[PDB]
């Protein structure tokens, strides 16, 4: 038989706040709304762990989402993500507060920091989960895709605490901000011997290269419906609103508007993005053979008898020259009024 643990000692659900020198990743706010949903099943509080150098004034931003306690570690050695000061602090945080569950994001920092501390406690950890269900006996039920997404798997961690789980970005929604914030911040400390590291950071350089089409998961594709080359400036500002790579059909290559590595189809790249927006493209068999395995296809075309609508998940019939600049004014509307 197996020795049992008392799960009454471990209470609270901690969201590790992901940030890059102060600017919080949006995966943190989606996990707060999920943690407040999961901890309402069991009656536990919701915690937030904060690690950095000059970020103690970013703590009451966490209080405006409903977080009960914001534990802030604000030592000068926590500027860039090195694993040994970050894992020693997260191990020190578990030894003091003893949470029941720790939710971190699926970022490359969260996919690196969470396994280092889960192996230190010999506790369970599930990867890039999509569904989180809480049981009333304090057991998190983590559903995650596996085999490249070909099956889903139900994982549970019944003995060890705190149970770790990494959550995929833009799966859950951020909650509405509270009008009055409750809770407090807690300034924590740690000795300087725990914050040394063999790895030292040279510099953190911004990615300043354009991604190739086969690696992109969002793509704005243009066709012969775009008349002149200066209309691409209206399209290039639209694709950076959603982060999309601008691609084209073979009439776009013959006019010289794009590099030949930006062509989608049999004579170009075969792509599988998460979202493709076809602008003025009739779904010809040479173009559609390189993009039919997209997970979501939006088509904007004036002709309703175009063959792109036989494969498009969202088929919009209309002119793109009146939709997209008017939609770009709808981008500034709900965002900046």
């Amino acid at each position: 038989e197996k020795v049992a643990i008392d799960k009454s000692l471990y209470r609270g659900i901690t969201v590790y706040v992901d940030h890059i020198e102060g600017q919080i990743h949006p995966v943190t706010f989606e996990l707060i709304g999920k943690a407040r949903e999961l901890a309402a099943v069991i009656g536990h509080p919701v915690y937030a762990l904060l690690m950095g150098t000059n970020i103690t004034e970013k703590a009451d931003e966490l209080l405006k989402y409903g977080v009960d306690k914001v534990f802030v570690y604000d030592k000068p050695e926590l500027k860039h993500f090195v694993i040994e000061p970050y894992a020693n602090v997260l191990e020190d945080f578990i030894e003091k507060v003893k949470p029941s569950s720790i939710l971190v994001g699926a970022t490359n920092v969260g996919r690196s920091l969470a396994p280092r501390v889960a192996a230190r406690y010999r506790t369970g950890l599930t990867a890039d989960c999509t569904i989180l269900e809480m049981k009333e006996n304090t057991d998190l039920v983590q559903i995650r895709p596996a085999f490249g997404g070909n099956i889903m798997a139900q994982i549970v961690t019944e003995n060890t605490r705190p149970q770790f789980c990494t959550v995929r970005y833009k799966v859950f929604t951020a909650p509405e901000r509270v009008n009055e914030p409750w809770g407090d911040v807690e300034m924590m400390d740690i000795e300087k011997a725990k914050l040394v590291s063999a790895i030292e950071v040279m510099e953190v350089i911004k990615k300043e290269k354009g991604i190739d089409l086969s690696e992109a998961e969002t793509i704005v594709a243009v066709g012969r419906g775009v008349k002149c080359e200066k209309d691409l400036d209206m399209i290039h500002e639209f694709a950076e609103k959603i982060g999309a790579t601008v691609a084209c059909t073979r009439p776009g290559i013959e006019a010289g508007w794009f590099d030949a590595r930006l062509q989608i189809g049999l004579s170009g790249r075969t792509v599988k993005p998460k979202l493709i927006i076809a602008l003025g493209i009739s779904g010809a068999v040479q173009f559609a053979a390189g993009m039919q395995n997209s997970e979501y296809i939006i088509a904007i075309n004036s002709d309703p008898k175009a063959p792109i609508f036989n494969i498009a998940h969202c088929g919009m019939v209309g002119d793109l020259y009146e939709i997209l600049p008017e939609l770009l004014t709808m981008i500034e509307g709900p965002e900046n009024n």
Partner: protein, 265 residues
């Protein structure tokens, strides 16, 4: 540098997998199993460092005796020696028990200046055996390495990527690295190396008797905190929706869809 360990795994030959609705076990089409493509980038990263530093390369695998084929496959690409971790008490393991028996087999094989794990497998997709293995070894680790800028005999200068930045780090030996997809193009297994003896190496197998911690509570299914409850196909649905009526009647429907998919555009 000099001593380099590469952790490789045998995976199913294809990931096109579906479950029987009441077997509970995977409907795998066949067993033409292979070395996983993410560990080919880890093997190729060791080959570029051996051509610059001149040391040796050891391959390490954990699985059944069928996993000896990917140890012979790494030999045809240019590995110097291999080690299997085949035992009945090691099966059924999750990440915490796999990274423990891989770290126990590392201490049995001596010291290494660098351990190179791949980004992820193709059956588990957890991408976290590497960071858990370096915790049991006590060595520093850097994940998602796209570029090695310097290859000094004491340490490496690496380029670790995030979603939007490039961290440049100087990590010393001993350390673990986790390379990701398309760091280099992996070389092909040579048939000329296959005809040497069968290959020179002669895989050294280790069991639980050979480990420095010979206690089966920390290995296999007994040392696993997690377990699968059920596996099921993912529910996906294709909905064809049309939108007519021009003006901003379509632009509110396009912004309503782009915000529902959290693109915010």
């Amino acid at each position: 540098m000099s001593k380099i360990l590469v952790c490789i795994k045998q995976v199913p030959g294809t990931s096109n997998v579906e479950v029987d609705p009441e077997t509970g076990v995977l409907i795998r089409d066949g067993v033409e199993s292979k070395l996983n493509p993410y560990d080919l980038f880890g093997l190729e990263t060791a080959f570029r460092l051996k051509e610059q530093l001149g040391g040796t390369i050891t391959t390490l695998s954990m699985g059944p005796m069928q996993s000896k084929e990917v140890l012979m496959e790494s030999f045809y690409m240019g590995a110097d020696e291999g080690c299997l971790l085949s035992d009945r008490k090691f099966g059924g393991a999750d990440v915490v028990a796999t990274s423990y028996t891989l770290a126990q087999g590392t201490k049995r094989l001596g010291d290494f200046d660098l351990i190179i794990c791949g980004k992820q497998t193709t059956d588990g997709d957890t991408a976290q055996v590497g960071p858990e293995m370096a915790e049991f070894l006590g060595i520093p680790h850097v994940t998602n390495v796209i570029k090695i800028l310097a290859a000094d005999e004491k340490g490496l200068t690496l380029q670790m990527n995030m979603e939007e930045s490039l961290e440049i780090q100087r990590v010393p030996y001993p350390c673990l690295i986790t390379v990701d997809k398309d760091i280099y193009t992996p070389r092909l297994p040579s048939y000329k190396r296959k005809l040497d003896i069968s290959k020179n190496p002669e895989i050294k197998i280790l069991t639980l008797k050979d480990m420095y911690d010979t206690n089966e509570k920390k290995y296999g299914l007994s040392g696993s905190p997690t377990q699968v409850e059920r596996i099921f196909p993912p529910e996906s649905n294709v909905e064809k929706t049309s939108f007519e009526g021009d003006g901003k009647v379509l632009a509110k429907a396009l912004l309503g869809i782009l915000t529902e998919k959290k693109y915010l555009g």
